[PDB]
Swiss-Prot record:
Transmembrane segments: none annotated. This is Palmitoleoyl-protein carboxylesterase NOTUM. Keywords: Glycoprotein, Hydrolase, Phosphoprotein, Secreted, Serine esterase, Signal, Wnt signaling pathway. It comes from the Eukaryota. Belongs to the pectinacetylesterase family. Notum subfamily. One of its GO terms (biological process) is bone development. It catalyses: [Wnt protein]-O-(9Z)-hexadecenoyl-L-serine + H2O = [Wnt protein]-L-serine + (9Z)-hexadecenoate + H(+). The lineage of its organism: Eukaryota, Metazoa, Chordata, Craniata, Vertebrata. Rarely expressed in adult normal tissues. Carboxylesterase that acts as a key negative regulator of the Wnt signaling pathway by specifically mediating depalmitoleoylation of WNT proteins. Serine palmitoleoylation of WNT proteins is required for efficient binding to frizzled receptors. Changing residue 145 to A: Abolishes enzyme activity. Unable to mediate serine depalmitoleoylation of WNT proteins. The active site is at 145 (charge relay system), 253 (charge relay system), 302 (charge relay system). It comes from Homo sapiens. Induction: Up-regulated in hepatocellular carcinoma (HCC) with high intracellular beta-catenin.
Amino acid sequence: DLRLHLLLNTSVTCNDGSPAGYYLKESRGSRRWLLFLEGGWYCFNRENCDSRYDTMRRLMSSRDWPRTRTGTGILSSQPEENPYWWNANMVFIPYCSSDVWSGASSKSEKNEYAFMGALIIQEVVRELLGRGLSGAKVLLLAGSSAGGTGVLLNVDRVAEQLEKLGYPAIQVRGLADSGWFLDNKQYRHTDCVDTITCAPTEAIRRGIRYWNGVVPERCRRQFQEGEEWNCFFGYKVYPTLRSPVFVVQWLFDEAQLTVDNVHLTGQPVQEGLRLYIQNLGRELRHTLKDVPASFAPACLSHEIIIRSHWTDVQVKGTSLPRALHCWDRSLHTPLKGCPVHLVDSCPWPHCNPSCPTG
Ligand SMILES: *[C@@H]1O[C@H](CO)[C@@H](O)[C@H](O)[C@H]1NC(C)=O
Ligand SMILES: O=C(O)[C@@H]1CCN(c2ccccc2)C1
């Protein structure tokens, strides 16, 4: 249902220099726009992006992008699959910058790759205005995993872009899915080699210099020069944002456990690992105590909002599509039977019976 449009500005490129783009399915009756940021980890050094270019080149190049994409989950136009925003204008921005959407550089005779993730977002927004976005009432910038962190990094930058362009009426909002990470200690130590096993703290420290990534303004002014890597972590950057942001985060995100060098696959879970996993879930719940619009089930899973069965998980008897709807009403204090702060308290993966089974 979603049609590919490569960016008309040819200089806003993927990692290999091929043009970036976006998939679009218009809904001319609706004033609502969903711009989804794809995820897909990252690469924080040259001789490791090359490995990514060999087996994950679709995340670094638009050469072989399909002309058409199917909208799933919150990007679906069917009420059965998306009871929340099925009538909205759908935009899927493919992740081809490998920079957690923070780059604003350009490939040259001194850089192998281009990291323009932040420039991709603003250019898509720029080119969407002439295709109906100028009439929008709500622009919800959503994303999963790396895209979810990209939302936190870019939602204020999009709001200010629409304001400088002369669109004060467009309410820019954020939906950050599975991009709320902790810079915690690993369960077992590894050296930072390879993307999936490197500790979260050291991954971003290496990455942000390598991509020359940018961070939201007020967050940069708190941590200042050399410490902007702090702003890639939700519990640090979220208090500095001005746009309304809904946070969706599994309490036991598989990617968070991966960068922590945790592998729940074999029966014996010793008391040391049990303590680590329980403390991890406790710490994540604590970072969300002051996030008024949040959805955090106690599940071991990865991503939600573009999975076809995202309507099934419940926290305290409320599904995410309903929680997202109550969030809409809050922005039209607590509502009558329409909760927006939904954080599980039980301390072990799958203690919520509605957790995804597979
Ligand atoms: C295209 O995007 C690049 C990257 O930011 C920018 O420098 C350039 O001014 C843009 N060109 C046009 C015509 O918008
Ligand atoms: O699943 C993914 O896309 C990646 C897993 C680790 N990520 C991350 C870590 C720390 C800060 C921000 C992002 C994003």
